[PDB]
Amino acid sequence: AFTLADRVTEEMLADKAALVVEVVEENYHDAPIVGIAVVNEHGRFFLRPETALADPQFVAWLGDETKKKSMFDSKRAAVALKWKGIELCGVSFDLLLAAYLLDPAQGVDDVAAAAKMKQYEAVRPDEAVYGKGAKRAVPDEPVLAEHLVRKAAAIWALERPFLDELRRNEQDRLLVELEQPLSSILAEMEFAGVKVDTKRLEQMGEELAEQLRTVEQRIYELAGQEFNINSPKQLGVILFEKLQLPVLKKTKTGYSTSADVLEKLAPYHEIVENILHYRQLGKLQSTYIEGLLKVVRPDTKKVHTIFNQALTQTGRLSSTEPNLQNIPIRLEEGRKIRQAFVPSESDWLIFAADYSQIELRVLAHIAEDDNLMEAFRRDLDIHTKTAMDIFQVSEDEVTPNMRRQAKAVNFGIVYGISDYGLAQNLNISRKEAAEFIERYFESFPGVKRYMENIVQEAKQKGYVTTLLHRRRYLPDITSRNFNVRSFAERMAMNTPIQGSAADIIKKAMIDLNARLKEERLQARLLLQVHDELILEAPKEEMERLCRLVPEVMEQAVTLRVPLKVDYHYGSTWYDAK
DNA sequence: GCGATCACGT
DNA sequence: GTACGTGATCGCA
Ligand SMILES: [Mg+2]
């Protein structure tokens, strides 16, 4: 049982408690808090939020760093409270982040899923209480209060076992000194938001719509027929079958119309290049322009992303609504969408800094490959140097296609691509792709040793780790299915690289946030995507940031090779280049 | 409301 | 068969 309280009492405000501040809406920005539960040494309490959040003693307790709180996904509560003008401090244990560090593959999305990891089942899944989809609804207070109280009781009971296993894993500091402090920095970033120039966005959409009408009219002209170009089925009817173009690749059900396949079909009919153009502009328009305009808050003309800190299996952050990482880094209209992201105040500017080749630099360090480390200590062009070694040619002898092929081999390492995906990448056979890989290993024998050694370690221990002791379990590394084992092998190889890079960027964000406040700068972190950190700041702060930000980022950790940072600033995210 | 297909990132 | 994740569109029960 528990106290369904009508008012806040002093025994509810002890200096250690499990706390539940429930936000049912998936997007928690400016969203309702439907109820509150507190479990501490004196009992179990349910508080109605309209009551507790107006109580000065309760508000002071929430904001008191010395009053320690154990929670699940504290960033959600922290942000929903920020929109109410209330500060949450003193969160000493976050069970979502603890379960994520223990085993990111579990997919722990609620208290019940984390509780099940330690045989605790006296709590329901959130989906059982609130329902999913069209049926989703807050239940009546008796059902709601029991659920919130059981979640707090579970949290109270699970802190010690989770912390104990974290300590056995040497992940206790990872949680306490990296993920939890980062959680709060993300909260501030999400709350601050990023100003969007919606008039510029609507202009680009208008530009695209006119271009799409032009190309679409041309496609119907060449097809001799109207159809939904956006329907891969109707389009497969028209390309193959009608226009008799070869079928070079099949889909599980019908005709494949992938971009990779269409480019090879272009020499046969003028429609293909226009189909390719329609899909380019179509995805910019439909996914990015219209997608971004939907998530801009009209009150403040900002987008307020949500970072999922406990999702990837590498430790990389991910973000949604909007996912600004997914914005293209390529075309002279994809990356230009970044012109719509502007400073939120007059006479402020965007400052953007990004790690240069951090993954390959991490690989140099972990593998202690002599040639790769010397390349970075010389600050070489890594793709040019790789081409020199693979093709045994001098720097002036490297042609553009040689550099492209070396860069594709390096890209394969950074993202853990199979030789078939390298072959697919380079439009070459798997045999040729394999001999490319072998020549790489001849020039970087330390990388080869690392790749053999890490697979063997994964087989022996069951998992691999990153620089700051993140882990990834790889049960499929034993599989007799070739493709399943091969993927686990590539994840054994890739996760210490990508995940250690994630570690460094997170530590950099923490280090930078501390330095900015030490320095009493108004500059603020706004986004972290790819290997980049984006800030905004008064224009009067740019010269100081030009020294401060790269220094903090370069010194976040000390590797056997230097860390290199490129930095720019400008009037938009695009112009910070 | 799900698979399935595509295109973006990892 | 030969790469998972995000998110949009279009298909089908
Ligand atoms: Mg990246």
Q: Write out the DSSP string of A125-155.
A: -HHHHH-SGGG--PPPHHHHHHHHHHHHHHH
Other CB atoms within a 10 A radius of the CB of residue A474 amount to 24
The neighbour count for residue A514, using CB atoms within 10 Å, is: 13
Nearest residue by alpha-carbon distance to C1' of C1: A483
Which two structure tokens, joined as six digits, stand for A393?
């040619």
The protein residue nearest C2 (Cα–C1') is A420
At A71, which helix (H) or strand (E)?
strand A68-71
The secondary structure element, H or E, covering residue A192 is helix A180-192
Please, which residues bridge with residue A307 across strands?
A319
- Residue A190 three-state SS: helix
Residue A530 assigned to a binding site = yes
What number of CA atoms fall less than 13 Å from residue A366's CA on the CB side?
Answer: 27
In angstroms, how far is C4 C1' from A456 CA?
Answer: 23
Residues A543, A548, A550, CA angle at the centre, nearest 5°? 105
- A253 sits within 7 Å of strand B by its CB: yes
CA distances from A247 to A227, A260, A264, A271 (A): 20, 13, 11, 16
**Technique used to solve these coordinates:** X-ray
CA distance A339 to A114: 41
Tell me the backbone φ, ψ of residue A245, rounded to 5 degrees: -80, 150
What's the Å distance between residue A156 CA and nucleotide C13 C1'?
45
What's the N-to-C CA distance of chain A in angstroms? Answer: 59
Angstrom distance (rounded) from CA A334 to CA A454: 37
What SS3 class is residue A294? helix
Residue with tokens 């502009």: A281
Helix, strand, coil: what percent of chain A each, to 5? Answer: 55, 15, 30
Kind and range of the H or E element at A52? Answer: helix A49-52
The separation, in Å, between residue A408 CA and nucleotide B3 C1' comes to 33
A79 neighbors A178 (Cβ within 8 angstroms): no
Q: For chain A, which residues make up each domain, given as ranges?
A: 1-191, 192-306, 307-357+502-576, 358-501
The token pair that represents A185 in the structure block: 């920095």
CA of A231 to C1' of C12 (A): 14
> Which residues face A22 on adjacent strands?
A35
- Whether A77 and A183 have beta carbons less than 8 Å apart is answered as no
Contacts of A396 (CB under 8 A, 6+ apart): none
Q: Is A327 annotated as a binding residue?
A: no
Q: Decide: CB of A571 under 7 A of nucleic strand B.
A: no
- Centroid of ligand 1 to alpha carbon of A504 (angstroms): 12
- Centroid of ligand 1 to alpha carbon of A531 (angstroms): 5
Q: In this structure, are residues A12 and A38 in contact, taking their beta carbons and an 8 Å threshold?
A: yes
Residue A293 to residue A285: CA distance in whole angstroms: 11
Return the closest-CA partner of residue A298 out of A175, A378, A201. A201
Give me the CA A86–C1' C3 separation in Å, rounded.
Answer: 43
Smallest CA-to-CA distance from A23 within A13, A14, A15, A33 is with A33
> What 3-state DSSP class applies to A50?
helix
Query: For residue A530, what are the CA distances in angstroms to A425, A466, A501?
Result: 21, 18, 10
b/e map A370-393, b = 16+ CB within 10 Å = eebbebbeeeebbbbbbbbbbbee
The annotation status of A381 as a binding-site residue, yes or no, is: no
SS3 state at A489: helix
| Residue A357 in marked binding region | yes
Q: Are the CB atoms for A359 and A501 separated by under 8 Å?
A: yes
The residue among A351, A354, A367 whose CA lies nearest residue A564 is A354
> CA torsion sign, A535 to A541 to A545 to A546?
positive
Give Cα A293 to chain centroid, integer Å. 21
Rounded to whole angstroms, the distance from the CA of residue A249 to the C1' of nucleotide B6 is: 14
Annotated binding-site residue? A338: yes
Tell me the backbone φ, ψ of residue A3, rounded to 5 degrees: -90, 115
Can you count the helices (H) and strands (E) in chain A?
23, 17
**Whole-angstrom Cα distance, residue A176 to residue A332?**
42
Nucleotide with minimal C1' distance from the CA of A232 is: B5
Strand nucleotide closest to residue A417 (CA to C1'): C3
Task: Please report where in the chains the tokens 């530009």 appear, as a residue.
Answer: A207
Closest CA to A48 of A82, A12, A89: A12
Superfamily grouping for domain A192-306: Taq DNA Polymerase; Chain T, domain 4 (1.20.1060.10)
Nearest nt (C1') from A251 Cα: B5
Task: Tell me which H or E stretch contains A275.
Answer: helix A271-283
Enclosing H/E stretch for A196: strand A194-196
Q: Of chain A residues 87-146, which have a beta carbon within 7 Å of strand B?
A: 132-134
Q: Report whether the peptide linkage leading into residue A322 is cis, meaning its omega lies within 30 degrees of zero.
A: yes
Q: How far apart are CA A307 and CA A187, in angstroms?
A: 9
Distance separating alpha carbons of residues A535 and A570, to the nearest angstrom: 11
Hey, which residues does A84 pair with through a beta bridge?
none
Q: Sign of torsion, CA A370 A373 A375 A378?
A: negative
Evaluated on CA atoms A75, A351, A332, A502, the torsion sign reads negative
Between CA A484 and C1' C1 the distance (Å) reads 11
The CATH number of A307-357+502-576 is which of 3.40.50.300, 2.60.40.1930, 3.30.70.370, 3.90.226.30? 3.30.70.370
How many residues can be counted in chain A?
577
Nearest to A385 by CA among A374, A415, A433: A374
A403 annotated ligand binder: yes
Inter-residue contact A472 to A313 (CB < 8 Å): yes
> For A313, which DSSP code?
S
Resolution as reported, in Å: 2.0
Between CA A371 and CA A436 the distance in angstroms is: 17
Q: Is the CB of A285 under 7 A from strand B?
A: no
> How does A399-426 read in b/e, with b if 16+ C-beta sit within 10 Å?
eeebbebbbbbbbbbbebbbbebbbebb
Q: What is the distance in angstroms measured between the alpha-carbon CA of A261 and the sugar C1' of C2?
A: 16
H helices present in A193-258, as ranges: 198-223, 232-237
b/e per residue A516-536 (b: at least 16 CB within 10 A): beeeebebbbbbbbebbbbbb
| Residues near A398 by beta carbon (within 8 Å), at least 6 away in sequence | A384, A387, A388, A391
CB of A383 nearer than 7 A to strand B: no
CA–centroid distance, A529 to ligand 1, in Å, is: 7
Which residue approaches C7 most closely, CA to C1'?
Answer: A287
Q: A330: which nucleotide lies closest, measuring CA to C1'?
A: B8
- Considering only CA atoms, which residue is closest to the C1' of nucleotide B1? A133
Q: Three-state SS for A474?
A: coil
What angle is formed at CA A410 by the lines to CA A409 and CA A413, rounded to 5 degrees?
95
One-letter amino acid of A284:
L
**Residue written as tokens 């056997």?**
A560
Distance A405 CA to ligand 1 centre (A): 20
3.90.1150.10, 3.40.50.1000, 3.60.9.10, 3.30.420.10: which CATH number matches A1-191?
3.30.420.10
Report the separation in Å between the CA atom of A573 and the middle of ligand 1, taken as the mean of its atom positions: 17
Q: Using the CA of A529, which nucleotide's C1' is the nearest one?
A: B9
CB A280 under 7 Å to nucleic chain B? yes
CB under 7 Å from strand C: A 228, 230-231, 233-234, 252, 286-287, 290-291, 294, 311-313, 318, 320-323, 326, 415-418, 420-421, 482-483, 486-487
